[PDB]
Amino acid sequence: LAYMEGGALRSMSDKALGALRLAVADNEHLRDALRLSEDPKRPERKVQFFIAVYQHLRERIRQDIIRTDDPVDAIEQMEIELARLTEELTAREQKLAI
Amino acid sequence: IQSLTARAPVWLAAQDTLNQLCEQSGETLASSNDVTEYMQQLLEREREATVERDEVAAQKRELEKQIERLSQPSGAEDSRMIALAERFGGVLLSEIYDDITIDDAPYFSALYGPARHGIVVPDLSLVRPHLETLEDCPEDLYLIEGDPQSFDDSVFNAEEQTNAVLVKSSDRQWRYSRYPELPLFGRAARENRLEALNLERDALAERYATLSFDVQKIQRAHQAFSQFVGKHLSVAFDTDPEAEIRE
Amino acid sequence: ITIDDAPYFSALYGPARHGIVVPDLSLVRPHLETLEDCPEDLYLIEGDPQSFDDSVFNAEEQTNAVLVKSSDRQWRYSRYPELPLFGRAARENRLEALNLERDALAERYATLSFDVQKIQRAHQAFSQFVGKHLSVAFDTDPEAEIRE
């Protein structure tokens, strides 16, 4: 993005914030951090929000079965878990039927 | 300078995408040809993992089929044994011997032979009409005559031997039943054994899930590489503009 | 034995289909306790291997099935199987059909491999082009500019 004027950057930021609004509807702490982050005179808050995201995304890892501190690398582990749980669901359905 | 600046953003985005893609892999890419050999290695790993996954899946399916075969009403040839059992006022012999001990279970199973799973019908004349109708049934259906509640032991030409039983099934004909393990009769701990089968299949399913996830990961990596090359090759491995622009 | 009655013979014999024609029965009883690898429900019959008399059954023929008084209070109902243990005649045509299917699969694999080879070659040609002529690819003719 180093070679793009500021107006387009503002537009992408606006669209991303619009998406985040829907995305973080459920959470309250992340929602509050986002609501703080839009003050143009406190830029660091935005950065903090990102940290607050990753930080949060780490605590809810459920590290009991996951290890990757980086949430980006935990998508594979969640996919593994969904596949395993689909197998377990099939087994449970058969057991309930019998 | 303006030409290089115009070229810049495309090159920079390409470099970032390529770096992410390669770092995701253990290897670092340096050429279009190198990307092609990486694709070939990806295909090799995929065509391997799929074979192991299918083999594990076949083993798994066999395990669940075996587990089910022991399920209901009392683990037996319940595919048609059910209808064959309630359609006539009889009771499964295996169920009749459901509570026999694990020790007497092998002896009685060997004694009864292929007739272990038979159905007790004191008349044998209820099945006489329906016999012609039966075209969907186990290739060898077994029936015994007596009181289902208190059936008297089938009279046999039995002859017990060490961990086995000889029997004379018909004139000049002997069947020698070696004491089986984990028999048909005594279907109380056989439920425990099908539980053991479930335990066994747990690891099979775990391994199958790991193989399936590996297959999915390789597929997604290949698709990402394809999309990359679709958007990316035009500027891949080209010189850095930023240094030129600064100079 | 004939193909026609082979399913009948198999249905009649049941699990006793697989049996050894030992006219003595005396080598088994001492060795009976000595048999451990043998099939759990081993079947043995007394008869002459040179001329094996028809085995003893109280057989009644139902439509594509049989009922035999196997023993007292034991009437056994069986159906006609396919590819019976008796009358195999080496069933060589089944082997041939399986070989036909395998050979068709191999031919299909060969054709697909040839197609993959051609696709690989085309890919390598494209890579070669983009490695050596991509820079000037699709660009205009400089002769007009030179003349201008």
TrEMBL record, chain B:
<feature type="binding site">
    <location>
        <position position="246"/>
    </location>
    <ligand>
        <name>(R)-4'-phosphopantetheine</name>
    </ligand>
</feature>
<feature type="domain" description="MukB hinge">
    <location>
        <begin position="52"/>
        <end position="217"/>
    </location>
</feature>
<feature type="region of interest" description="Flexible hinge">
    <location>
        <begin position="73"/>
        <end position="190"/>
    </location>
</feature>
<comment type="subunit">
    <text>Homodimerization via its hinge domain. Binds to DNA via its C-terminal region. Interacts, and probably forms a ternary complex, with MukE and MukF via its C-terminal region. The complex formation is stimulated by calcium or magnesium. Interacts with tubulin-related protein FtsZ.</text>
</comment>
<comment type="similarity">
    <text>Belongs to the SMC family. MukB subfamily.</text>
</comment>
<comment type="function">
    <text>Plays a central role in chromosome condensation, segregation and cell cycle progression. Functions as a homodimer, which is essential for chromosome partition. Involved in negative DNA supercoiling in vivo, and by this means organize and compact chromosomes. May achieve or facilitate chromosome segregation by condensation DNA from both sides of a centrally located replisome during cell division.</text>
</comment>
<protein>
    <recommendedName>
        <fullName>Chromosome partition protein MukB</fullName>
    </recommendedName>
</protein>
<feature type="coiled-coil region">
    <location>
        <begin position="39"/>
        <end position="66"/>
    </location>
</feature>
